[PDB]
């Protein structure tokens, strides 16, 4: 039964304290601004680096192999970007991990208020 199923799957995670909530939005927006600061570095699009983050977070080749028979080239327009942003100084590097964890927290927020 899928009905009780969903309810129990969302009942597998605690909600959030006011603290957890505020902090969530905080780190999330810090990652969203981090990407924005990355666009000003290697000179890429706002959403490019953004999605490419999910390409290493939301999963391996499963995220770009089925958004329809066409989304955007995985080995071409992405892999080059996964290594283009890879050679940057310590100044720019942290703003990447802030994008990974920042965008990560988003999911936590959704799961929480689910």
């Amino acid at each position: 039964d899928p009905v009780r199923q969903y309810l129990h799957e969302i009942g597998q995670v605690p909600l959030l304290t006011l603290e957890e909530e505020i902090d969530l939005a905080r780190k999330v927006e810090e990652g969203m601004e981090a990407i924005k600061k990355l666009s000003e570095a290697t000179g890429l699009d706002q959403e490019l680096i953004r999605e490419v983050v999910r390409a290493k977070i939301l999963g391996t080749a499963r995220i770009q192999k089925i958004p329809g028979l066409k989304e955007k080239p995985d080995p071409k327009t992405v892999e080059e970007v996964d290594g283009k942003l890879k050679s940057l100084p310590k100044e720019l590097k942290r703003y990447l991990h802030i994008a990974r964890e920042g965008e990560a927290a988003r999911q936590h927020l959704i799961e929480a208020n689910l």
Binding site: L18, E19, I22, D23, R26
Partner: protein
């Protein structure tokens, strides 16, 4: 809990029959055995400042604005004067008795020697820890890591 640092170059007047005589005194390290309850003798005039440090005391002697001198009172060397009160030269600043060891939170680096007869002056460069607590709120998030060495005017939280 941020434990801050405080640096001061202060002098001391203690007889030579005391003077544990070391270039470096750790916290609680015994200093100046003495004989009798020696009266700290002010070598300058001015108004004092009593800044109480744990067991120890500190006397800033200044005329008007600028400081004329700074004195260090080891643990058990007791203040004879009230902060801000006007004093004179040779006046009975403080009194040590027997032991009068170094304070428990403070160190001593780069000692000095000025010795005249039964008495001796020691200029010690003293640095201690004057900690303080900060209550964090949900409207806040800590930045700096645990057990980190912080700068001046640093964003903590």
């Amino acid at each position: 809990r941020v434990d801050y640092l405080r640096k001061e170059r202060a002098a001391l007047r203690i007889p030579l029959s005391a003077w544990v005589e070391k270039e470096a005194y750790r916290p609680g390290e015994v200093l100046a055995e003495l004989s009798e309850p020696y009266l700290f003798r002010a070598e300058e005039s001015g108004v004092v400042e009593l800044k109480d440090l744990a067991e120890g005391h500190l006397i800033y002697l200044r005329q008007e604005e600028e400081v004329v001198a700074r004195y260090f009172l080891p643990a058990g060397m007791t203040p004879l004067v009230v902060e801000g009160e006007i004093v004179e030269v040779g006046q009975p600043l403080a009194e040590g008795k027997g032991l009068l060891r170094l304070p428990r939170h403070m160190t001593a680096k780069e000692v000095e020697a000025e010795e005249e007869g039964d008495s001796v002056h020691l200029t010690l460069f003293l640095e201690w820890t004057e900690p303080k607590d900060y209550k964090v709120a949900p409207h806040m998030n800590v930045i700096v890591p645990e057990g980190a060495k912080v700068q001046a005017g640093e964003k903590i939280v």
